[PDB]
């Protein structure tokens, strides 16, 4: 279903609050994003890890140069956090992603996996900043 | 769902400070910050 898959969709507004929070390669790795390719067609890709690009760009108020190593079945390349769209996974895009996953041979994540992963972002959002992370954030 | 937004001292940049947290700005890092105007009906009589 597309509705259950949009629960872990990391929109463009949520990523602005974890630009410098540690454990970025743990809570983010697992979710899906609607990266814009470019005309209005979109392709859902899996978050394999985290990379850092040499180009510095501003995204509204804040500004980040980090990348995002994504993959859509087999075709993989470097992307940016500025091309991500806030739209939800449509039926056509959902079917396209399902077909790409089936063709690439990657087993579809089980429903319980998404159910237990969606809580990661929720518990990270209300995380108290009691440790020594503000120093690294300001740096 | 009000996280008690604040305004930094010198940056004048909004910050979300909750209870049991240090009082510092999201960037640079200072120790002074003020509050924002209330949302109540501030109504005066031009007298």
């Amino acid at each position: 279903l597309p509705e259950e898959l949009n629960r872990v969709r990391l929109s463009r507004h949520k990523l602005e609050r974890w630009c410098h929070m540690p454990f970025f390669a743990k809570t983010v790795t697992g979710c899906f994003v609607r990266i814009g390719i470019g005309k209005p067609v979109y392709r859902v890709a899996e978050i394999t890890g985290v990379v850092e690009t040499a180009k510095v760009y501003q995204l509204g108020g804040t500004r980040t140069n980090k990348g995002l190593q994504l993959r859509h079945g087999n075709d993989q390349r470097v992307f940016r956090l500025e091309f991500v769209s806030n739209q939800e996974f449509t039926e056509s895009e959902f079917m396209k992603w399902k077909e790409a996953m089936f063709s690439a041979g990657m087993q579809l994540p089980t429903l319980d996996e998404i159910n237990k992963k969606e809580l990661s972002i929720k518990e990270a959002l209300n995380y108290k900043f009691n440790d020594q992370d503000i120093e690294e954030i300001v740096k | 769902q009000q996280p008690m937004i604040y305004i930094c001292g010198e940056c004048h940049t909004e910050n979300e400070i909750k209870s049991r947290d240090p009082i510092r700005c999201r960037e640079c890092g200072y120790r002074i910050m003020y509050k924002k105007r209330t949302k109540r009906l501030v109504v005066f009589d031009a007298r």
Partner: peptide
């Protein structure tokens, strides 16, 4: 205050660049 999108703020594309 999770995501005040209200659509969005004109999201750029990859090939457009």
């Amino acid at each position: 205050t999770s995501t005040y999108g209200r659509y969005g703020s004109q999201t750029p594309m990859y090939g457009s660049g």
